[PDB]
Amino acid sequence: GSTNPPPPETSNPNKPKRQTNQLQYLLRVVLKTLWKHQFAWPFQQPVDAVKLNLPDYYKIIKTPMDMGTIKKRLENNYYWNAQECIQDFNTMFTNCYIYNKPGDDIVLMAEALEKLFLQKINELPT
Numbered sequence: 001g002s003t004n005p006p007p008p009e010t011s012n013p014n015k016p017k018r019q020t021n022q023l024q025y026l027l028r029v030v031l032k033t034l035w036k037h038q039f040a041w042p043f044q045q046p047v048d049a050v051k052l053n054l055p056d057y058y059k060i061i062k063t064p065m066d067m068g069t070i071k072k073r074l075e076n077n078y079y080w081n082a083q084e085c086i087q088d089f090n091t092m093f094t095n096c097y098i099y100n101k102p103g104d105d106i107v108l109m110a111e112a113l114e115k116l117f118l119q120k121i122n123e124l125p126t
């Protein structure tokens with residue numbers, strides 16, 4: 001597998017976008033808390049399948065997502081509402097569970113980050 005795909009889009013002037021209190025919270029509180037977790041690092045940028053020697057990763061994962069992309073989307077006011085952003089977090093975790101297996105180290109890492117994520121979004125601003 002010789003190259004990585006282009007990363008997901010992080011800017012789109014034409015997409016409907018808003019700054020909501022929930023989207024501000026998702027950047028300021030949720031993403032920033034997660035970012036500092038000991039297990040965050042594999043999720044801080046797109047999977048580099050070339051470096052990691054995973055030539056099947058982008059054969060299996062067709063909607064890549066990561067917290068670096070999310071952070072850029074948030075910073076670029078990409079999203080209309082918090083649900084759109086939440087869906088990108090869910091895609092990121094789901095991708096990890098698809099490519100890997102229960103018990104794998106990376107899965108344990110995603111499970112811990114997901115638990116945190118869910119705790120933080122349990123209550124959102126109005």
Ligand SMILES: Cc1nnc2n1-c1ccccc1N(c1ccc(Cl)cc1)C[C@H]2C
Nearest residue numbers: 042043047048052054096099100105106
């Ligand atoms: C995310 C994610 N989803 N799948 C993986 N990634 C990774 C991304 C970046 C670096 C390493 C990753 N993995 C990984 C990270 C930490 C440990 Cl202890 C073991 C494996 C494996 C890779 C198959």
